[PDB]
Symmetry: D3
Subunit: 304 residues, 6 copies
C-alpha cells in the first residue's frame, strides 16, 4: 500500500493542546470546582465519578474561554495574553473545538447514558446563549433585561447546570437542584458584568471596561441604555468598540449618571435573597445544612 | 420569582442557524450523499437509519465549511460569499459549533449504543487533522508527503469514515469498509488540492489558486517546495499569503517547472488503482458488483 | 502696527474652490436646470432673477455632492474620482461648506426680504433629511417606508423646493407649486435608488450597487429587508459595507427574490400618476399646458 | 395621496443635535461670552438682543469645533472624546453643518437686515481661514508668518468679529471696534498656538502637542521651521502626523533649540501692547474706562 | 575554544542572493549590454576586461532594481512580482546592498588602479540622484525641469557613465565619451518617464501609470504641474499615491490637456539631435562609423 | 547644449545626509572608538591615519543603524525616534547606502591598496551576517547556537574586524589581532542580546524587549526555544512581532523559567576568560601590558 496510517503521537497531541495548555497554566479563581464541592455536600457523588465531572467542567470552561476570547476579540485573559495572541486565532479555535470533544470522550467514562443526553442538551444551550449575545451585539440592538437573563441562563448557567446535572445523574436522590444552580449562574454573570466595569482587579485581568471594547450588551449597560433612549451616546460607544480609555472612562461616567450600578447591585441583592430562600427550602425538606454553598454565594457577591 | 425561564423559539433557532442555512441554500455537489448511496449498495442500511446518517453527515459537512472558511480566511465558497463575510466571523463560528451538537443530537435518534463513540472518534480525528495542518501553516514548516497524507486521512477522511462507520453500525454485515473509504478520502483531497490550482471551475468557485492565498501546504505545493529546497520562492510566497493574482500565477508557473502536477496525477493514478483493487477484493469475497462506487471514483478524479 | 490686513486674492479663491471647480468641470446631467426651466413656463420669473436662482441651485447642488460623497465614503462621482480622493476629505468638506455661504451671498442679489428665510428653511430641511438617513445607517435600524419618504422629501426634495420657492418669491402669480415639486423630488430619489442597483449607466458612474457599499437604507433595500424579517442576510450585508462585487451581486440577487424592484416600479407608477393628476389640476385651474414638465417626469423615470 | 408629509418631532431634533449637545455638555472656558460682556460695557446692547448674539456665537463656536475636530482628525476635545469618536464623522459633520443654519435662523430674530450681511461675510471669512490652513497643511508648504496671521484673522478672528459686529449693528454708536477685536483674536490664537505645545493643562485637554499630530503650521512651528531651512526635521515630523509621544517630545525639544517659544512670547508681548494702546485710544475719545476687557486681555496672555 | 569560525557555503550564498537571482531569472531587455557593445566598437576593450565590466554593470543594475522597487513601493517588475513581494523588503534590501559589494569585488579583477575611484564616483552620483528624487517626492515640492535633468544625469546616467568610464579606463584611446553617454542616459530616462504613462507594453510590465502611484515627479508630470500652477489636481493626485485606475486615468487625461506629452516628444527630438551631432563629431575626428549606437539611439526613443 | 550639468552643492549634500546627520547628533556610547584606542596601544598607527579609520568606522556604524532600524522595523534608537520615522524609510535607506560609499571614498585617503580589499571583504561579511539573521527571522526557523555565532562574527564582529584590520594595514607589526577582536565582537553582541531583554537602560533606549517585537532569534531566545521544543509559546510570540508589553513580559517570564539568562551569563563568562587568556597570550610574546583593552572588556560585560 502507498499510504500507511500512523498512530497519533504525544508530540502531536502536545501541538493540538498548545493553546489549551497555555490557558490551564494561567492561574484562575477555580469557582466552578468550588461550586461542585458545595453541591456534593448534598449529592454525595463518589470520588471516582466526581473527579470525572470536575475534569469535564474544567475542560469545557477553558475551551469556551479560548473561543470567547476569539469571538469577543479580547486582549487579556487572567491578566495575561489571550491564547490566540500567541497561537493565532485558527489554532486556538481548533484547540478549543477539539477539547469540546475530548470532554465528550471523558463524559463517556461515566458509562451513564443519561450523562450523554445531558452533555448534548448543555452544549446546545451554551451555543444558544452565545448565539443570542452575538446577535444583539452585531445588530446593535439592545435587548430587554428579560431577554438578557434568558441568554445568560443558557450561556453562563449552561455550564453550571451541566456540572450539577451530571452529578444528579450520578446520584440517586430525587431532588431538582437545577433551578437553584441556574439562579447561581445568573447571579455570577450579573456580578461579573458589574465587576468588568468597576473592579480594579478586573481592570488588571481584562483591561479597563473591556465589555465596552467588545460591544457587549451587559447588564448595567442595558439598563443605562434603556433608562434614557433619547441619549444614544452609550449605545454608540458600544458600536465603536473603543480600545481607548478616554472613551471608556466617559462611558463608565455616563453609566454612573444613570444610576446603573445601584440598579445592578439592587438586582443582585434581590437574586441573592431568592437563592438563600431556595437553599433554605431544600434544607427544610430533608437536606442537611450546607455552609459551603452559602460561602460560594457570599464570595461571588462581594461587590469589589 | 424575578427570573422566569422562557422556551427556545423558532425565531431564535432561525437566528442561530442564519449562517448555516445560508451555506445550505448555496447549490453544492452533494458528493458525500453520492458516496453514502454507493456504499449502501453493500451495507443496505434501513431507510430510516440512512436518512438520519445522511442528515448527520450533511449538517457536519456544512458546519465544518463555516469553520474552515473562517480559519482559512477564505473569500468565496461555492462561487458565492463565504458565510462570515455576510454574518461576521463570530456568528459564523458559533453557528458551525452549534451545528456540531445539533448533529450529535440527531445521531442519538439511531439509538445505537456504539454511535456516540463513532461520532466522538471522528470529530476528534477531524480536529486532529485540521490541528496539524494549521500547525504546519502557522509555523511555515513544510511537512513530508507521508505526514500530509496522515493529516489528510484525519481531516478529509475523518468525515468520510464517520459516514461509513455509522452505516456499518446500523447494518447486519460485518465487512470493514473503512480502509477503502479512507483511501477514497485521501484521493478526494489530493484531487481537490490539484484542482484548486489548475481548474477553471475552481478558480470561479473559490478564486484563482486560493490555497496559496491561505498559505496551505497542499499536495502539489509540498512536492514543489521539496523538489528543490535551494530555491525558496514558493515557500516564501506562502508566507506572504498573497491575494494578488500576479504572485499566484508566478507560483503556479514555478510549480509547473518542478513538474509537480504530473507527480500529483501519477500519485492519484496509483491510489485509484489501489482503490479498484480493494473494491475488486471486496467483490471477489461476496459483495455484489458496485458500479456506483466506480462512478464516484471516476468522477472525483475526472480532471486528473 | 505689527499685523496689517491683506485683501482676499483671486489665487486664494482658486485654492478654496479647488474641489468645487473640479466637480463642476465633470460633465453632469444638469437636471435641476431642466426642472427650473419647466416651472418657469408657469412662474415666468424675470431673466436676471432666474439667472441668480439658477446659480444658487447649481452651487448648492455641487456643494452637497462634495459633502455627501465624503459622508458616504464614495469612490466615483459622475464616472470620475470623487473630489476628496483628489483633494482630501478636509479640503473637500471646507470647499463644500464654503460654497453654502457663497450661495447665500448670491441669494442676496435678489434683494427679496423673504429669500433668506426660504434659503434657511431649505438648508435646515436638507440637513434634517441627511441627519435621519445617517442615523438609520449608523444604527443599522431599518426605517419604515413612510419614514424613508419623509426623509427623502427633506433630503432630495429640500433642494428642489428651494428652487421653486425662490422662483415663486420672484414671480407675480400666487400658485403653490411646492407639493408638486416635493412629489417630483421623492420620485427622482426613488428612481435614483432603483437605478443605483439596476442600471449599467450607474454601475459605470458610481460603481456596481454602491448604496450597498455605503450601507444605505434605500427604497428597494428597505422593502427587501422588511418583506422577510426572518432572513437577515441583506441587513447584515449593509453592516459589512462591502466593496467586493461578489457580496453585492448576491445582495442584488436576494433583492430580486423578494420582488423588491417590481414593488419599486409599481410605487413609481403610482407616484407619477399623482404627479400627472396634480399637473393636470394646475392646468385646469388656469396655467397653460406644460409639455416640458411632462418630459422631465418621463425622463427621470425612463428606466422604470 | 400616497405620501403624507410629517412634522419634525423633538425626538428627531434630538438625534440631529446628538453630537452638538454632547459638546455643549462638556465644560469649557467660555471666553467668547466674556469677550461679548467686556465689549458691552461700551456698546450697551440690550439684554434681549445680546442674549440672541450670545446664543449665535456659542452655537457657531461648538459647530466649528465639531467640524475642526473631524477635519483635523483630533482625539480629544475639552479633555473628553471628540464627538465624532462617539457619533462617527458623518453624523458629527452633519450636526455641525446643521447648527450653522440653526444659528442663521437665530440671527434672523434680530430683524436686522445688516446682521444678515454680517453673518454671511463672517461665515465666508471663517471658511476662507480654514481653507488656507488646510491648503498649507496638505501641501506641506510652510507659510510665512504674515500669511499665517492673515489666515488666523479670518479663522479665529472671524468669529470674534462676528460677535462684535452683530453688537455694533444693534447699537447706534459710530465707533469701529473691529480692528481691536480682530487683534484680540490674533493674540488669542497665537496664545493658543503656544499653549498647545507648552501647557500641562492643554496636554490634559487635547494630548501632548496635538498640533504636531495634526500637521498644523502653527505660529511657533512656522518660526522654528523658517529659522533654519537647512534642517528639515521639524517639517518632516509634521508630514508624519505622529501620534507617538517620543516624536512629539523630540519636536518640542528641537523647537526650544530654535528659541521659537521666546520668539512667540515676545510677539504676544508686542501685540498686547498694541491692544492696550488701541483700548486707551478708544477711551481718550469718549468711551468710559473698561476694566473687563483689560482682564480678558490679561487672562488670554498668562503664558502658563 | 568555544567559538570556531566556519566557512561561507554555497547554500548560504544561495540564500543571500535569493532575491537577486529571482530578478535575473526574469526576462529583461539587457539594454546596457547593447550600449556597452556599441561603445566597444570605438573603445575596443579586450574581451576579458569587457566581460568583467559587463558582469559588474549587470549586477549593479539588478541590485538597484531590488532597492528602487522597495523605495518606490512598486508592485510589478518586468511584468512579474517585484522581489520584495516574494522575499520581503528586508531580504530584498540586503540582497541588493550585498550585491553592490560583490560587484566592487568583481571590479577589482580588472587590476586597474583607477577603477575603484570610478566605481566610488558612480555609486555616489547614483545615490545623489536618487536622494534628490526622494527629497522632492517626500516633500511634495515640484522640481524645475533643469533640476530634474541634473538629478536624472546622476540617477540614470550614473550607471551608464560607470560602464563607459570603466571601459575608457581599460582602453588605449583617450577620447572622452562621458558627455555623450550621460546625454544618452537623460534621453533613456525621459523616454522611460513618457512610456510609463503612455505605453501598453509598460502598463503590462509595471502597471498602468505607475509613476503616479509612486508619487514621482517625472518629466511629463513636472511639465503638466508647472504649466498651470493654479490648478492643483495633478500634484494633489501625486500626494494621494493612488493605486486606483480611475484616479490615474483622470491624471493621464489632465496631462494630455496641458499638452505635456507633445512637449516631452519635442524635448526628446531635441536631445536625440544633439546626440547625433555629438556622435557625428566624434566620427569626423577619427573614430569609425558606429551603426550600433545609432540603433540603440533609435530603439530607446522608438515609441517617441 | 540643452542640458548643462550642475555641481553638487552643500545644500544638496545636507539633504542626502539628513537622516545620517540626525543619528550622529543623538548621543551614543562610542564603544568602537574606545575599541580602536585600546588596540592602538599595540599597533601605534599615527594620528593622521587613525583619524581616518575612526571616521570610516563611525560612518559605517551609523549607516548600518539607519538600515537595520528600517529592516528591523524599530521605533527607538538611542532613546529617540528612529531616523526613518522622521525622514521616511526611503530617504533613510538611501542616506545610509550613500554613506557606505562616502566611507569607501574615505578609506581611499589611506592610499593603501590593502585597505580597499579589507573594506570590500568586510562589507561582504557584514551583509552576509544580516543576510542569515534575516533568513532565520523570516522563515521562523530557530538556528543553532553555533549558527548564531557564525552569523554574529560576520554581522557584529565584521565592523570590529574592519576597524582593527585597517589598523593592521597601517602598521608594520606582524601579529594577528583579528581572532581577539572577533571574539570581542561576539561577546559584545551576546551582551547586547542579554541587555535588550534585561536592562532598564535598554528599555529606555529601544523599548521593552524590542528583540521580541523584531522577531530576532537572539542568543537567550535561541537557548530558551531550544531548551524545550515541546513548548512553542516563545517561537510563536516571535512570529507575532508583538508591540504590546503584556506579551513581552510573558515571554521574558517564560525565558527566565528556562534559565536562559543564567545560561547566557555563563557563556559570556567563558568567552571573557578566553579573551583575557588571548590578551595575556599576545603580551607574553612581545606586546606591552594593555590596561585599556582590559577595561573595554570589563565595560561590555557588566551585566546590568
Amino acid at each position: 500500500s502507498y499510504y500507511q496510517r500512523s498512530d497519533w503521537t504525544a508530540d502531536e497531541e502536545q501541538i493540538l493542546l498548545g493553546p489549551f495548555d497555555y490557558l490551564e497554566s494561567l492561574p484562575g479563581k477555580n469557582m466552578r470546582s468550588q461550586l461542585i464541592q458545595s453541591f456534593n455536600t448534598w449529592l454525595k457523588v463518589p470520588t471516582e465519578s466526581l473527579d470525572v465531572i470536575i475534569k469535564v467542567i474544567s475542560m469545557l470552561h477553558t475551551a469556551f474561554l479560548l473561543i470567547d476570547d476569539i469571538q469577543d476579540q479580547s486582549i487579556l485573559r487572567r491578566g495575561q495574553p489571550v491564547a490566540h495572541s500567541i497561537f493565532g486565532t485558527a489554532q486556538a479555535m481548533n484547540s478549543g473545538n477539539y477539547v469540546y470533544f475530548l470532554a465528550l470522550r471523558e463524559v463517556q467514562k461515566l458509562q451513564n447514558p443519561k450523562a450523554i443526553s445531558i452533555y448534548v442538551d448543555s452544549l446546545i444551550d451554551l451555543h444558544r446563549g452565545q448565539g443570542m449575545e452575538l446577535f444583539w451585539r452585531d445588530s446593535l440592538m439592545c435587548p430587554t433585561e428579560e431577554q438578557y437573563l434568558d441568554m445568560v441562563a443558557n450561556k453562563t448557567g449552561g455550564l453550571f447546570c451541566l456540572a450539577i446535572q451530571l452529578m444528579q445523574a450520578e446520584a440517586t436522590i430525587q431532588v431538582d437542584f437545577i433551578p437553584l444552580v441556574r439562579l447561581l449562574g445568573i447571579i455570577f454573570q450579573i456580578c461579573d458584568d458589574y465587576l468588568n466595569l468597576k473592579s480594579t482587579a478586573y481592570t488588571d485581568n481584562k483591561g479597563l471596561c473591556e465589555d465596552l471594547t467588545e460591544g457587549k450588551f451587559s447588564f448595567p449597560i442595558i439598563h443605562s441604555i434603556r433608562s434614557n433612549p433619547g441619549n444614544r451616546q452609550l449605545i454608540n460607544i458600544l458600536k465603536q468598540k473603543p480600545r481607548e480609555d478616554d472613551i471608556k472612562r466617559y462611558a463608565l461616567s455616563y453609566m454612573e449618571s444613570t444610576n446603573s450600578f445601584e440598579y445592578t447591585r439592587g438586582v443582585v441583592r434581590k437574586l441573592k435573597t431568592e437563592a438563600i430562600d431556595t437553599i433554605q427550602g431544600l434544607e427544610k425538606h430533608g437536606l442537611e445544612e450546607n455552609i459551603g454553598i452559602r460561602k460560594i454565594l457570599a464570595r461571588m457577591s462581594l461587590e469589589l
